[PDB]
Every structure is written in C-alpha cells, then in structure tokens.
C-alpha cells in the first residue's frame, strides 16, 4: 500500500537522554504533541549546512504519547539536532569527541 | 486509554516497610522516565527519584537515600516505590509519573498513612492574591543552571485540591497540548515565569516549577494562587 505521510506540524518532545552508540551514532527517543498523526518527523542534523545524516530511513509518528527511535550519525565535534518545523521546533546541541 | 494507576491506601505501624505499585495502560513503561513524588498533606511536591524502566537505573534525590527504593516490572508494566522504616515524617500521597520533558501522566496517588552543594529551586511568590481577569507572574530561581543540549528543562505545573498535578508548560516556554493558551513561560538559565493571564477562576491551585536536565529532578516551593479578599 502506498505509504505516504505528511511533515508533521506540531511539537516534538525529547523522551530520554541522547544515547551514543558503540558505531560512532546516536539514538534520540522523540514523541509526538501535535496533530495529524501518523506523519513524517521533520530531522536534520545542521550548525548554529547539512552535517549529519539519518540512519532511521523513514521516521514517523503512529500516535501521540508514544516515542519513536531516532538513530542518526552526527559529524565529529559540534553540531545542531533540529527536530519538528517552527513554532517551537526541538533545537538540540549536540558534540560528537 | 493512556493511564498511570496505583494501588490503594496504606495504613502502617511505626518502622515497618510497605511497597507501592504504578501500573501503565495504553503505553509502554520502558518508553521514557518513571518518577515518584512525595506530597505531605497540604505542603510542596517532593522528587523521590527517577527510574529507566527499560535498563533499571536508578537516581534519588539525597533525602531519600536509605529510605527510597524505585524499582520496575516491564512484563506486568509496573513501577514500583519501596519506603523502609516508616514514620509519621513518611506520612504523605505518594504520586508516579511518567516523561523528562515535564510530568504529563500522573498517577491517582496512594496515601501512606503511618499509625501506632545540593541544588536550590527558590519560587516566590508563596502566595499569590489576584482579581478575576488580572494577570498573574510566578518566578522560579534555580542554584544551578537547567540546560541540557542548549535547552532549559525548566516545567510548570497546576495542582488543584485532591488532585494529582497538571502539565501546563515544559522546555521553559512551551505550552502543553490541551492547556488553554492563558498559561505562558520564559526565561533562561537560572531566572524563569509562569504567565497566567487573564486569570479565570477555575485557575485558583498552587503552582508548581520544576528542573528535569540532571538528577535531582527538583520542583520549587509552590505558589498558592487565592482570589483578592
């Protein structure tokens, strides 16, 4: 069935602490505050340009209150997790040593 | 239906040791933190600790130490609060609460009847007196800074009489789903408001700010909000 999600509108929510993976990659647990879920989680790893990228291929929301795993491989050093569009978009700093 | 329930109230001779449960339908306790509060009769929430259902670790604010312990069942989906060598100091609604990003979930509480270099949350003010429709601000002051990835874990909660407390802004500024648009926060790094405006009247509750970035997960004082007499 042809799978097909809208970008999601409403805020995200950070559900534990970032883990670091052993593959130099991170796991950030997210859940969904705004409507028209399921939809397809907005993520992009960039600076204060695109720096990082997405290990999860397609990640979507199935309902609110229900946290999703996120695995993306962040660039060595400094770098910005932005999760969701405005109003209040999930801005997370994050450096990879 | 997404809820968090306790086990019924407990009536406890002096130095003996009771268990509480918390049990989760309609989601996962492994999904995020499972918390347990404390809440003498007509006093400030307290932050026990802070449990990862799925891993088992485990974080306690100091003046729980020897006399806390927070444990988990994720077959049965259950958290649980171990209290050992009760007193009447013990006596209190015992609340489990789910999230990092503020406590939306909250158990019905379970009442705990007993029978025969830290981090400083400064709320003012500890009352509040305020006319139908006027604008009302609460400050919280934290000792230490609330940041975590760039973010301030700074929270705000409603909690009426007999009532579990209720999520209105977590993040510092962002207003819950669900909470009416009159609830508003700001602020950064250790100075942060709670914004209740215009006030209505079912908006008389004491309030409550709390920090989540790093163990203890500690609320403030609480601010009793009263009608101008």
């Known amino acids: 069935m042809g799978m097909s999600y809208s970008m999601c509108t409403g805020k995200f929510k950070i559900v534990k602490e970032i883990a670091e993976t052993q593959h130099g990659t991170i796991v950030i647990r997210v859940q969904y505050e705004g409507d028209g879920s399921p939809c397809k989680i907005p993520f992009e790893i960039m600076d204060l340009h695109v720096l990082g990228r997405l290990i999860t291929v397609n990640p979507i929301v199935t309902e609110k209150d229900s946290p999703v795993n996120i695995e993306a491989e962040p660039p060595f050093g400094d770098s910005y997790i932005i999760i969701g569009v405005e109003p209040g978009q999930l801005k997370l700093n994050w450096f990879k040593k | 239906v997404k809820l968090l329930e306790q086990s019924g109230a407990e009536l406890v001779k002096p130095g003996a040791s009771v268990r509480l449960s918390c049990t989760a339908s309609?989601?996962?306790?492994?999904?995020?933190?499972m918390s347990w509060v404390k809440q003498r009769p007509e006093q400030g929430l307290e932050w026990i600790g802070r449990?990862?259902?799925?891993?088992?670790?485990?974080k306690y604010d100091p003046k729980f130490q020897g006399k806390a312990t927070i444990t988990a069942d994720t077959s049965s989906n259950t958290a649980y609060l171990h209290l050992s060598s009760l007193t009447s100091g013990d006596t209190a609604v015992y609340y489990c609460?789910?999230?990092?990003?503020?406590?939306?979930?909250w158990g019905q509480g379970t009442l705990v009847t007993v029978s025969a270099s830290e981090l400083v949350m400064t709320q003012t003010p500890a009352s509040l007196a305020v006319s139908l429709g006027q604008r009302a601000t609460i400050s919280c002051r934290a000792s230490?800074?609330?940041?975590?990835?760039?973010?301030?874990?700074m929270h705000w909660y409603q909690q009426k009489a007999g009532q579990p407390p209720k999520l209105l802004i977590y993040?510092?500024?962002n207003l819950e789903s669900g909470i009416p648009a009159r609830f508003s926060g700001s602020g950064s790094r250790t100075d942060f408001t709670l914004t209740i405006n215009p006030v209505e009247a079912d908006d008389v509750a004491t309030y409550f700010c709390?920090?989540?970035?790093?163990?203890?997960?500690?609320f403030g004082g609480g601010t009793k909000l009263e009608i101008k007499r």
């Open positions: 609460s789910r999230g990092w990003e503020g406590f939306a979930y």
């Open positions: 309609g989601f996962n306790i492994k999904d995020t933190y």
């Open positions: 449990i990862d259902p799925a891993n088992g670790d485990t």
């Open positions: 230490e800074n609330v940041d975590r990835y760039g973010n301030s874990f």
């Open positions: 993040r510092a500024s």
């Open positions: 709390q920090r989540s970035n790093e163990v203890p997960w500690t």
